[PDB]
Scaffold this active site. Structure first.
Site, short mmCIF file in Angstrom:
data_model
loop_
_atom_site.label_atom_id
_atom_site.label_comp_id
_atom_site.label_asym_id
_atom_site.label_seq_id
_atom_site.Cartn_x
_atom_site.Cartn_y
_atom_site.Cartn_z
N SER A 41 -23.21 -20.16 149.73
CA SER A 41 -22.29 -19.18 150.36
C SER A 41 -22.89 -17.78 150.35
CB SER A 41 -20.92 -19.14 149.68
OG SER A 41 -21.02 -19.08 148.27
N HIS A 53 -21.00 -27.71 147.46
CA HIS A 53 -20.85 -26.32 147.00
C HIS A 53 -19.38 -26.05 146.57
CE1 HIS A 53 -21.61 -22.20 146.31
NE2 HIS A 53 -21.54 -21.74 147.55
N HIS A 101 -25.64 -28.51 136.91
CA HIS A 101 -25.83 -27.34 137.76
C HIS A 101 -27.25 -27.34 138.27
CE1 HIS A 101 -25.87 -23.06 139.05
NE2 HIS A 101 -24.59 -23.29 139.24
N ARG A 153 -18.61 -19.13 132.10
CA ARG A 153 -17.46 -19.05 132.95
C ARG A 153 -16.49 -20.18 132.61
NH1 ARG A 153 -20.08 -19.60 138.80
NH2 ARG A 153 -20.82 -21.37 137.60
N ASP A 185 -16.20 -25.31 137.49
CA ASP A 185 -15.36 -26.19 138.31
C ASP A 185 -14.65 -27.30 137.54
OD1 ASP A 185 -16.70 -24.80 140.45
OD2 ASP A 185 -18.17 -26.46 140.72
O1 OAA Z 1 -24.56 -21.05 141.73
C1 OAA Z 1 -24.52 -22.09 142.43
O2 OAA Z 1 -25.56 -22.63 142.86
C2 OAA Z 1 -23.17 -22.65 142.82
C3 OAA Z 1 -22.15 -21.54 142.60
O3 OAA Z 1 -21.97 -20.63 143.41
C4 OAA Z 1 -21.40 -21.50 141.35
O4 OAA Z 1 -21.67 -22.35 140.44
O5 OAA Z 1 -20.55 -20.55 141.27
#
Ligand code: OAA
Ligand code: COA
Lengths: 438, 436
Positions: free
Chosen positions: A248, A278, A324, A333, A381
């Protein structure tokens, strides 16, 4: 005479010359080799290839995201809070990302007022949204409505009239603030298709913060919803930026680099965020957790969870919300969200939250023993969807819409800097398989 | 009695591509290049960093499509039932399969495109909601994204789809988008006729460019010259390797498994940028503004003065320069060669001004000393040829580019899914990290 501290644009003006000086110094070293390109990088989606500039955040693959060198816990302590609640404001996070400095509370109050004042929409956006069929995915809706706001673009209009390259950053900033101000209202309209006329016109309280006013537009205003307001603040601040290489962020930068305005550029970002690999992952995690709850019941033991995880992996499917592309260690986070739950008895007692928690204790070892998932810590997530579910957002296809609101923050910051620095169009070279064969 | 259709022809070449891919992947650890600071701060310029199968751009020779030049394709690819220019749907076939289709195969594919062109009601409704102030490329980008309600890939993925079977729904959606996008584009051109243009039957016996022309109100035998322009134009703009912004954005958003409608919508938002496809619009606005200032009778110095005024104002000279090409663009020359045999085109004063500027601007850009390539690109010439044929609102010129530029990026999405290419996810760094 005025009594106020510098506003956001003025605070930005104060740091632009220093960044341009640093850029000039780096550009003198243009020819320095910093890496190797391998066949793996070409066929592997540029994985590991340092190939783009991003100022506001850097992902330490060993320690998680840092915002101008600050950890999540650092930002939680330092950044201003709302008039009520204990969580850091996303508009304070924006200030930090953009300027590199922590704003005062008074500065954030003034910026929050601007965001409330600039939140109204042209009537054609309401008409557009009323045209959407019920079958249209909420992220398709959100991406379209954001692009449509390009009718309001100062950058597009100024460029059409003849704008010097030196003068690109200011209308880019103005459009970024406009989009920030409007996007929660747009997102509320996607959530509330039967209330477009009211939600689309209702005046915001200009003395409240961006997240509070988003909550009010979602129908979760007032003192009774104070915990949800704090969830939303934290969530929106945590998801604002995650360096440049995520799809994004990258898409926004890429389209912006052709001098498409911030509305078109972030619309491209949102189309990327709509991808299953994503931003839709948070939606899939929650669906998966509710399906697990249905199959194992609410009497579940550690062994029941372990068995379910093994069954999932033996079936050739992933455990969503683990792993990740870049980070290889626990996601701060994720921990921030679990700590938000720790002090809220109603959330801790939610059986769906208890399942997420137990899964987060058991899954990493199971995933490691299995060996197919790299970096098998819970990512943010794993937890976000359940917290929204708890607070009554129980529509399976809408979770990424809130991510879309948050993820305006960082990419818009980088667009402003891209224009202030004069970065050129993003245009790499491609090759075919035959050319790689030699 | 029927020759292989496009899907069947694709299925026949997939195994050989997967074999080649496996061979390349065995050499994953081979060093093929260096990353420099310039690549990071300079928009990846010169960094060979993505895969693209259907075309490869040589900085000196221009584009090749499976090793074929523009002139090779012009001679080899099938033509329409009238005219002498190569068909864009034949170009699609070539890009996708690597093979030149027979004329019979192209005729059958053209009929499929005509059959699949209809639009659901909600798309007509969406388009009627657009204000008259809305830029035509904004309209086009939005309407293409909205067609994601019709995505077979999105629905199949939501239900649970194995990775090996991603390509087929991707193909089906690609053909659906190709069939529909000229009608969407015509609705952008004809906002007061959405109900009629949005439902009218296409000529089932005619080619994709012809039917686009008809939807634009330029059908029939009297417009045969324009149909040939449009064929050539749509074929020339279909693909220009992977690194251009529209191709790249489509690949990038597609790599997260967004469907072809969402992914090409992202491509269109990039194509809408002044430095990429909007330069076709920007060229003709700049040419007309120059004509207004210098008049009917002008000197070479009047043109030079206008060029230098643009540069001194901190603006680009649209239609000159390129990220990769270092010589005049053979797509530009193909359009000028189209003009060369048509005395009415050559005599058009707006064309004469484009031509004269092409003889002056490269020297001015060289004197100015910023651009790495002072020579004209394809956008220098495309808009004036549409102008000549009666399309005189430059805010619509990039919409036709949007129709063309579905061709190549959709081909690569199909291959991306057939090969199983992963998400595009580079690493970034900050200036402070480069300074250390
Ligand atoms: O960082 C990434 O590749 C995917 C992302 O935006 C996230 O984990 O917030
Ligand atoms: C095509 C284009 C975007 C390529 O960008 P690029 O690869 O970054 O270009 P270069 O390496 O030649 O750029 C070097 C410098 O020359 C300038 N430059 C390039 N083309 C120029 C033009 N046509 N007019 C004026 N200045 C130009 C750049 O903006 C840049 O400025 P800076 O170093 O002062 O910051 C660029 O040539 C351009 O802007 N062209 C005009 C728009 C256009 O015709 N686009 C369609 C391309 S098919």
């Amino acid at each position: 005479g005025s009594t106020a501290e510098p506003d956001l644009k003025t605070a930005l003006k104060a740091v632009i010359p220093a960044k341009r000086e640093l850029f000039k110094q780096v550009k003198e070293r243009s020819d320095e080799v910093i890496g190797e390109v391998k066949v793996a990088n070409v066929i592997g989606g540029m994985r590991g290839l340092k190939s783009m500039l991003w100022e506001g955040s850097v992902l330490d693959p060993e320690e998680g995201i840092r915002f101008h060198g600050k950890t999540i816990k650092d930002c939680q302590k330092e950044l201003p809070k709302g008039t009520s609640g204990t969580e850091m404001l996303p508009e304070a996070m924006f200030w930090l990302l953009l300027t590199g400095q922590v704003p005062s509370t008074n500065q954030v109050r003034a910026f929050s007022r601007e965001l409330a004042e600039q939140s109204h929409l042209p009537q054609h956006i309401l008409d557009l949204i009323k045209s959407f069929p019920r079958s249209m995915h909420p992220m398709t809706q959100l991406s379209i409505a954001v692009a449509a706001l390009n009718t309001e673009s100062k950058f597009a209009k100024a460029y059409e009239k003849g704008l010097s390259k030196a003068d690109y950053w200011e209308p880019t900033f103005d459009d970024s603030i406009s989009l920030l101000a409007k996007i929660p209202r747009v997102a509320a309209l996607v959530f509330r298709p039967d209330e477009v006329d009211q939600v689309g016109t209702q005046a915001l309280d200009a003395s409240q913060d961006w997240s509070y006013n988003f909550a009010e537009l979602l129908g979760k205003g007032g003192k009774e919803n104070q915990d949800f307001h704090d969830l939303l603040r934290l969530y929106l601040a945590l998801h604002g930026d995650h360096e440049g290489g995520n799809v994004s962020a990258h898409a926004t930068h890429l389209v912006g680099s052709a001098l498409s305005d911030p509305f078109l550029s972030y619309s491209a970002g949102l189309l990327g965020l709509a991808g299953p690999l994503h931003g839709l992952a948070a939606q899939e995690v929650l669906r998966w957790i509710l399906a697990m709850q249905d199959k194992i019941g609410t009497k579940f033991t550690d062994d029941d969870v372990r068995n379910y995880l093994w069954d999932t992996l033996k079936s050739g499917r992933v455990v969503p919300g683990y792993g990740h592309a870049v980070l290889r260690k626990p996601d701060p986070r994720f921990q921030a969200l679990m700590d938000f739950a720790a002090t809220r008895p109603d959330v801790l007692a939610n059986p769906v939250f208890q399942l997420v928690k137990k899964n987060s204790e058991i899954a990493p070892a199971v995933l490691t023993e299995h060996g197919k998932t790299k970096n098998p810590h819970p990512n943010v997530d794993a937890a976000s969807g359940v917290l929204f579910y708890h607070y009554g957002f129980q529509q399976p296809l809408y979770y990424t819409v809130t991510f879309g609101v948050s993820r305006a923050l960082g990419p818009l910051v980088q667009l402003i800097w891209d224009r202030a620095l004069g970065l050129p169009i993003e245009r790499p070279k491609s090759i075919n398989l035959l050319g790689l064969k030699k």
